[PDB]
Symmetry: C3
Subunit: 89 residues, 3 copies
C-alpha cells in the first residue's frame, strides 16, 4: 500500500516535531475576582484554583467548583483565583 | 524533493489551524480533597495548587508536591486543591 | 468530499485530519502542570517569569493575601514570619 503507507509516516513525523513547540506556546491565564462579603465567583470557562479571605481567615471552601466561600464570622471580602488556558503565539 | 514538499506544506497548514482549536478545548479540571487532621493529599496524576485549613489557619505547606500540610497547632481539617488537564470536547 | 475537484489533495487532507484526531489526544496525555513553591522571609514572594501565581500561603496563621502584578504574593497581616507563592506552568512531559 505504498503512498498511503508513506504519507501517514510523514504526518506522524511532522506532528512529532511541531507538537511540543505548540504546547510550550500555551500558558496558564489566571486572574483574581474579589468581592466584599463571603463569596467570590469564577466565570464560566474557568476553574477555581484557590481562595483568599479578609480578616486573616484561612478557612475557605469552593462551592459547585465555581464560588469561593470564606467561612469565618463577619468577613469583609472574599477572593477567588480563576484560571483558563491561553495560546500565547 | 518535490511532491513530499507540497504534502509537507499541507500538513503544516492544517496543523496550524487544528492546534489552537484543540488546545482551547482543554481546561483545568480541579477538585478538593479534604481530611480531618493536618494532612490532605492529591492523587497520582494531579498537581496541588493550593491548600485550605480549619480554625482560620492560613499557614500551610505542600510536601513532596502531593500533600497539603496545615501548620497551626489548632487544625480541625485540611483541604487540598488538586488539578489535572481535561478535554472538554 | 461530495465530488472532490482535487481528489488527491482531499484524500490527503482527510488523512491528515483523521491522523491529527488520534495523534492529538495521545500527545496531550504527555502534558501536565509543573508547580512549585517559592518561599521568602517577609511579606512578599514572587513567581519567576514564564509561570503563573496560583495561591499564596502566609506564616502566623494569616489567610489574607493578594497577588501583585500577577507575579508577587503579598501577605497582608500586620506581622508575617514568611510568605510563599505557588507557581505553575504547563509543561510537556520530557
Amino acid at each position: 500500500c505504498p503512498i498511503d503507507e508513506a504519507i501517514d509516516k510523514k504526518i506522524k513525523q511532522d506532528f512529532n516535531s511541531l507538537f511540543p513547540n505548540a504546547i510550550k506556546n500555551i500558558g496558564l491565564n489566571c486572574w483574581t475576582v474579589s468581592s466584599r462579603g463571603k463569596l467570590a465567583s469564577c466565570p464560566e470557562g474557568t476553574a477555581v484554583l484557590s481562595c483568599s479571605c479578609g480578616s486573616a481567615c484561612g478557612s475557605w471552601d469552593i462551592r459547585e467548583e465555581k464560588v469561593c466561600h470564606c467561612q469565618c464570622a463577619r468577613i469583609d471580602w472574599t477572593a477567588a483565583r480563576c484560571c483558563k488556558l491561553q495560546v500565547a503565539s
